Each structure stands twice: as C-alpha cells, then as structure tokens.
Design a protein around this ligand. Structure first.
Ligand SMILES: [Mg+2]
Ligand SMILES: [Mg+2]
Ligand SMILES: [Mg+2]
Ligand SMILES: [Mg+2]
Ligand SMILES: [Mg+2]
Ligand SMILES: [Mg+2]
Ligand SMILES: [Mg+2]
Ligand SMILES: [Mg+2]
Ligand SMILES: [Mg+2]
Ligand SMILES: [Mg+2]
Ligand SMILES: [Mg+2]
Ligand SMILES: [Mg+2]
Ligand SMILES: [Mg+2]
Ligand SMILES: [Mg+2]
Ligand SMILES: [Mg+2]
Ligand SMILES: [Mg+2]
Ligand SMILES: [Mg+2]
Ligand SMILES: [Mg+2]
Ligand SMILES: [Zn+2]
Lengths: 122, 120, 50, 105, 203, 86
RNA sequence: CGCGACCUCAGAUCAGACGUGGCGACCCGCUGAAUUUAAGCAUAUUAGUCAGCGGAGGAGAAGAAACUAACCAGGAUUCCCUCAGUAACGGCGAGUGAACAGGGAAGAGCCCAGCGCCGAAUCCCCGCCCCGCGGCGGGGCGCGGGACAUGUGGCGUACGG
C-alpha cells in the first residue's frame, strides 16, 4: 500500500486531503504506541509515514503552484514568488530590449560606415 | 464673510485616504495553517502521575506544542477525539514542551476515553 | 531564580537537555574515536555565563 | 657606523616596504596568458592583419632621438585628405586616424 | 538665444538686478529647511549645460551647507604630541562645500544618482547648491540610450566615491606637470606604484 | 575591603543575551550590545581585532542562502525548467 | 464675496518600483597618529602610513590634452623596463625624491549643453483586440489621461558645423 508521487499526481484534492489526514491519524496512533511501548515495527513505520506525509504535501503544493502559474500566465503583474528569483543584481540590471536600444545617430553611423573585412597582401 | 477662522491655530486639514486596490497580490496563495490539530497534540503522557490524574480527576494529559494556547488545545481535543472538555491547565516543562492537562465534561469518562485512545 | 523569562527558560532547557551522556552504540559505530561526552557541565563546577 | 672607506649610501628602506613587496612569480603565467590572448584575437579577426592598423612614420621629438623614426599613434587628417579618403571609412578599413597630430613639413 | 541671455545675465552677478534677486532668493532658501526638493531648476541653463533634461526622472534638490573651515574634532583643543600636529582652528577640509552638498543629497535620496550640482547663492553663514539627481529606474530614463550609463551599477554613489565634477576638482587630477601626484589614476595609486618594491625573479 | 568580600556583593548582571549575534554582551542600562553594536543598523566591526573578525565573519555560520547561491551560480541561475522527465 | 487657472506645498496601508544591511584581498573618497630615526630633540622622518568613517565592481579608478616639448617635433588612459636614487626637497642634517623623451604590453574612440532649422517632430501611463509571453515586447485603434515651449526629439560638438 506504499504511495508514490507518480500515482499521486492524478487524484483530486478531496481524496488527496483524505489520504493526508488518514496518514496524520496513523502518525498520531504511532506516536501513542511509541509512548506506550508498542513495538519496533511501529517505531520503524514512523519514518515511513513521515516521509509519506512529506510526499503528499509536496504533491499538493506543487499542483497548487502550477495552477497559480497557469492562472497568472500572460498577466502583466505577477506575485513576488512567481516572478523569477535569479539574483538581486541580475534583477536590477536592464532587460535585453532596452539594452539593444540605440540612437538614430549611432545606427545611422552604423549604416553609413560599416566595419569592413580585409587582408593586406605581402 | 461668511467663512471665519474662530481659532488662532492652523491645523492640517483632513483629506481623503483611499483604501488599497492592488494590481496583484504580493503572495500567490494564503499560507497553510501549519498549526492544525495534529500539530497541536503531539502525544499523551503515560507516567504514574498521569494515570493518577486519569483515574481521579477525569482528566487526560498530553505533550503539546509550545505555540498552542488553551483554546487551541481544547478545540483540537474536542474535534479529533469527539468529546467535551471542562477546562485546560497548561505548563511548560524544564525540557521545553508544553504539558497540558485537559479535564473532561462530567458526562464523559476519562477511563473509557483512554481505552479508545489506547494509552490504557 | 523562580522568576524567569520565557527565553532564559528556553536557554536553560536546551542546556539541561544536552547535558547528557553519550549513547553506547556510538562506540560500536565504525570509525568512532569518541569515548565519552567531553563537554558535560556540572552545575557546581562550571557555571553558565548566563 | 662607517667602517673605514666606502660609499655614503642611502637605502630607501625606512617605510614598511615588505607589505608592498611585489614579486614576479606569475611572470611565465602572464606571458602564457598574453600569448593565448594574441592567438585568440588573431583567429577572431582571422583575415585582418593580426596586429592592428598600419601606423605612420614619426620622428622622435628630442635632439637626442630626432635622427631616428618610429611608429606613431596614427595618421593625420591632412595626409588622409591628400590620400583622398574619408576619415571614417579609413578607420573601417584599418588606417588608424589620429586627429590631434599636425604636419609642419 | 534666450539661454545665452540668461548665461550673460548670471555672469553679471554684481549688477543691481542680480544682486537683488540673489539676496531675496538667499533669504527664502534660508527660511526653508536644510535639505529640500525643488519643483524645478532655478537656473535652467546652468542645469541643462550640467546635464539636466526636462524629463520625468530628473529631480532637483536644494542643499544648504554651513560654510567656513574645518575645526579639528578633538576635546578641549588638545591634540597630543608634535606641535606640527597641534593645529586646531585654521585647518581646511580637502573637499569643497559643493562636494559635501552633493554627498548629503546622495545620502538622503540614496536610491537616486547624483549627476551634477551648481551654486544658487550663498550667505555669510550658509551656501546653497542645487543637485541634479536622476532616478535610475524610471522607464523614460532606462528606455532611452545616451543616459542608461547612470543606471548601470558601477555608478552608485558617484558623489561618495569622489567622481562628480566637484569631487574630481577636489581630487586634483589632470594632464601634465601640474599633476604628477595622481599620475596612475589617483593619488594613492601613484603612491602605491612608486612605493612598492619590484623584486623580479631574475634580479 | 576590596577583595573577597567585594566578590561577595556581586548579584546584579550588567549584560544579558543579545537578539542579534547571541552573545552575552547586551548592556542592560545602556541598551547596546558590546559585541555587535545592536540597537544600531550596522554591525560593530574593527580592523584592530582580526581574531574577532574571523570569529564572526561569513562562513563561521550556516550559510544556507549562500551555499544555494554557489550551486546556482555553477549552473547559471536557471529557473522554471525541468530535467525532461522519462 | 463665490467659481475657476496656475504656482508653491501637504496627506494617503493610493498604483507601480527603488534604496538600506553584509563582505571588504584588490579599488575610490575622506580622516589620520605615535612608537621609530635624527645616537638628545622641537622642523624633518616614521607617513598621507596604522587605527577610524563612507562607497563600489569583477575589477575599480583613470582616460581621448586649457598635454609634452623647444625637436626635422611628438600625440587619450593604464601597466612593465629605463630615466633614477637622478633634477629637486631637506635643523641642505638624518633623510626624502618625481617627471619628459626612448623601448615595450595593450590599443578605440565618442556624446551633450550652447549657437540654429524642422506645425513637439518627443516622452510616460491606461484600456481594445491582434501577433508573442517565460530577463514580456511589435505595430494598429481610443473626439483616452499626463509630462513637456521655464525646451523633448532629429541634425550637429572644435578633427569644425
Ligand atoms: Mg543627438
Ligand atoms: Mg501558567
Ligand atoms: Mg559556586
Ligand atoms: Mg615632526
Ligand atoms: Mg549598571
Ligand atoms: Mg501603495
Ligand atoms: Mg631620537
Ligand atoms: Mg638611542
Ligand atoms: Mg627622548
Ligand atoms: Mg586603514
Ligand atoms: Mg553598501
Ligand atoms: Mg570605470
Ligand atoms: Mg569616468
Ligand atoms: Mg645609473
Ligand atoms: Mg614622503
Ligand atoms: Mg601590440
Ligand atoms: Mg534641442
Ligand atoms: Mg575635444
Ligand atoms: Zn549582539
């Protein structure tokens, strides 16, 4: 009955939340058994259920985040965790369009006097 | 005439202050409530003083989160164990977790609640 | 003192939680070179700077 | 103290020199670096003549060296005019104008 | 021709018209606060020949500097040791009041770039300058060539690194025999180059 | 009597823990850290103690964000892409 | 005894952005000693150095002559060799101390204001849909708002136009 994210990524959020909260019920029971002595089998399934909980919460957060990205796709103002992250200085620097902007004088110079290609024979 | 300053003090005239209508939310989704009921209650306590409290004062005793207050502990117990709670006395232990004694309503019984939980 | 603040209680909680002997399976671990907890504090001998 | 006979010397070592001691252990490495930079530049301008524009002939400006001649910074606008080419197409071709040099001869 | 007339008029500073205007504007700048935003340049010809353009993203700040020399900040006038270093009173700061005006403007509006500055009347007690600042994130400025160099990140706090016009005049660098002290780029670059010891591999 | 009895009279702390930098050098009356200088925005740092500078410079702690920056720099600060699933 | 227009200011959890702090080996701007040496010591030296303060970048600063020179002249900046422990400064004591020419490494040049002409030609922001999204623009449309003649853009900058 071991759960995998490739099988988790097709469910709907009602059964995903159901799976999540039965896992949390089982983790609570396992900690009760841990205090009351229980058994080494239960103490070893503690880590299994915890990693399963981490798996389920990863899948839910990832689905919700990609739905948010799809909704904000093509919008003018996106939230601060949906705009890119790269580096503060790289965010401060110019974008390619206003980098490649040029003046009419300088592009007129470029049209009038292009740098030629040439060799000098000996 | 007919507008008259009846006071020697000029005060800053009150103006309009618009509410915010932002073009985009600063964060995407509301943050998940990471202090839910399963986070509130960690496990019961099963020491001899705990058993005395169970058989005498109709009260259970849990190790709970440090951030949880008596209202959250009472609501979490009443929800995930489906009982009624008379009161909640909490302390913080010298190890650093919150020990919460929860005394049940008199129509319920701590013995059979502990039997359903499994600490018995 | 009995009158504490929450964060000095947290500090003392951490200190007394980590004033504890080393487990015994650590010595059976491969490549151990640690025999006992060498930084154990006794309340009468070495005082917390707090 | 002076011993018997010798020069009066004045060593300029009174000024904490051995923080600003500069060594030359990176001299072969920087020779390799400049060499491969020249190679990269040449194969970047692969048909262009590998060293820069043509420089003019220039008389060295002192009675010690005014018999010799050397490469100058660039050709001037008057001699570009007598050669009959424009001062922008000259630099696109590879001629290295220098506008601030005069011709008095 | 208008700006040429204003330029000649502002060179005629001791005329009765200009001395009236300078006195009344000095009075009102004295009544204002020390750091202040002007709504427009008081001297538009001077501002435009110093770089200002009437666009969105160019702002003007009026700065007031308490003028006079620099007094040594030692307690009870007691420096300790060497009578050559005993001086307290007649000492002089190495930078100009115009440069410290630009520096105060930059340090307050630290999200803008100091382009330049000029003089708009002094006092006996104060000196009033106007500093041209540029917002380096306005589109009208970084969506136009010939001015996005100041939006480039190597130009943060030009007035604090000493490389506006007034700060450069304070640094004292030029071409020729008047300026041998700074002949490697700056004063301590020159000091470093002529006080290092080149110990070659093969000496 | 300046020795042992005067040691007897010591029961009021001058310093407590600091919110920044965590050392026990927060002067309670002065309201200032003697180690890091806190209430102030800039950290206290002096070139005359290189041992102190190396006791609390960058790299003596956890460097969570910085180790992720080092990895992401080695790969070029890419975002929004996936390793092309099987 | 009002209603507008501008100017000069103010307020806002107004719409969208930006700065702060860290590190500091190298870089830039200030500030800046005393030990020491002078067989004492005060100018000098240490030294424009240490300590102190501010600001950066992958380099920084500098930089296309209000230059060198006095030649049959050279030709931005930076760095190396040399000039040179020299010219010079200095209780002319102790000590300090460059530049130009020359040979190399590298090599790249440019833009405003002003003066003038072109029906402001100019720029920002907001909606419409179309062609794109993945560091977000292209053009079109609006009897749509603002900036701007208290001067935006094109030509054009001492080598002239
Ligand atoms: Mg133009
Ligand atoms: Mg209590
Ligand atoms: Mg004791
Ligand atoms: Mg002296
Ligand atoms: Mg006290
Ligand atoms: Mg807002
Ligand atoms: Mg002596
Ligand atoms: Mg002696
Ligand atoms: Mg003595
Ligand atoms: Mg220092
Ligand atoms: Mg900083
Ligand atoms: Mg630069
Ligand atoms: Mg520059
Ligand atoms: Mg010699
Ligand atoms: Mg000297
Ligand atoms: Mg070469
Ligand atoms: Mg014009
Ligand atoms: Mg020129
Ligand atoms: Zn602190």
């Amino acid at each position: 009955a071991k759960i995998k994210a490739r099988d988790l990524r097709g469910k709907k959020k009602e059964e995903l939340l159901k799976q999540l909260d039965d896992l949390k019920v089982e983790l609570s029971q396992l900690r009760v058994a841990k205090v009351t002595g229980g058994a080494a089998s239960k103490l070893s399934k503690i880590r299994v259920v915890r990693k399963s909980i981490a798996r389920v919460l990863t899948v839910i957060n990832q689905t919700q985040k990609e739905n948010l990205r799809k909704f904000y796709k093509g919008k003018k103002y996106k939230p601060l965790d949906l705009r890119p992250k790269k580096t503060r200085a790289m965010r401060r620097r110019l974008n390619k369009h206003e980098e490649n902007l040029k003046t009419k004088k300088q592009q007129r110079k470029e049209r009038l006097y292009p740098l030629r290609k040439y060799a000098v024979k000996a | 005439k007919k507008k008259i300053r009846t006071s020697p003090t000029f005060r800053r005239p009150k103006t309009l202050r618009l509410r915010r209508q932002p073009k985009y939310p600063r964060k995407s989704a509301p943050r998940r409530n990471k202090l839910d009921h399963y986070a509130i209650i960690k496990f019961p306590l099963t020491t001899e003083s705990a058993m005395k409290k169970i058989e005498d004062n109709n009260t259970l005793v849990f190790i709970v989160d440090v951030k949880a207050n008596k209202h959250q502990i009472k609501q979490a117990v009443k929800k995930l164990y489906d009982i009624d709670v008379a009161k909640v006395n909490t302390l913080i232990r010298p190890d650093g977790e919150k020990k919460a004694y929860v005394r049940l309503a008199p129509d319920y019984d701590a013995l059979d609640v502990a039997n359903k939980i499994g600490i018995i | 003192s009995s009158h504490k603040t929450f964060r000095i209680k947290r500090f003392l909680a951490k200190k007394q939680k980590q004033n504890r002997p080393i487990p015994q399976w650590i010595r059976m671990k491969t490549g151990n070179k640690i025999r006992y907890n060498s930084k154990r504090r006794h309340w009468r001998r070495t005082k917390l700077g707090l | 103290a002076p011993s018997r006979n010798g020069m009066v010397l004045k060593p300029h070592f009174h000024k904490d020199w051995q923080r600003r001691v500069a060594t030359w252990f990176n001299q072969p490495a920087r020779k390799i670096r400049r060499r491969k930079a020249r190679q990269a530049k040449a194969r970047r301008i692969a048909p262009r003549p590998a060293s820069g524009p043509i420089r003019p002939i220039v008389r060295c400006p002192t009675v010690r060296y005014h018999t010799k001649v050397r490469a100058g910074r660039g050709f001037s606008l008057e001699e570009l005019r007598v050669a009959g080419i424009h001062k922008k197409v000259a630099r696109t071709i590879g001629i290295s104008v220098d506008p601030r040099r005069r011709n008095k001869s | 021709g208008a700006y040429k007339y204003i330029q000649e008029l502002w060179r005629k500073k001791q005329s009765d018209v200009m001395r009236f205007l300078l006195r009344v504007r000095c009075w009102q700048y004295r009544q204002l606060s020390a750091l202040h935003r002007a709504p427009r340049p008081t001297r538009p010809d001077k501002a435009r020949r110093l770089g200002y353009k009437a666009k969105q993203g160019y702002v003007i700040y009026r700065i007031r500097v308490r003028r006079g020399g620099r007094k040594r900040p030692v307690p009870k006038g007691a420096t300790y040791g060497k009578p050559v270093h005993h001086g307290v009173n007649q000492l002089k700061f190495a930078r100009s009041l115009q440069s410290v005006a630009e520096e105060r403007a930059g340090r307050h509006c630290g999200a803008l770039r100091v382009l330049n500055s000029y003089w708009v009347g002094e006092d006996s007690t104060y000196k009033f300058f106007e500093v041209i600042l540029i917002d380096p994130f306005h589109k009208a400025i970084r969506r136009n060539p010939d001015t996005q160099w100041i939006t480039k990140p190597v130009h943060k706090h030009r007035e604090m690194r000493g490389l506006t016009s007034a700060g450069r005049k304070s640094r004292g660098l030029g071409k020729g025999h008047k300026f041998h002290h700074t002949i490697g780029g700056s004063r301590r670059a020159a000091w470093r180059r002529r006080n290092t010891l080149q110990l070659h591999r093969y000496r | 009597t300046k020795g042992t009895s005067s040691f007897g009279k010591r029961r009021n702390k001058t310093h407590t823990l600091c919110r920044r930098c965590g050392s026990k050098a927060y002067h309670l009356q002065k309201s200032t850290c003697g180690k890091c200088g806190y209430p102030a925005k800039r950290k206290r740092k002096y070139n005359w103690s290189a041992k102190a500078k190396r006791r609390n410079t960058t790299g003596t702690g956890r460097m969570r964000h910085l180790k992720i920056v080092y990895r992401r720099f080695r790969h070029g600060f890419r975002e929004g892409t996936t390793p092309k699933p099987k």
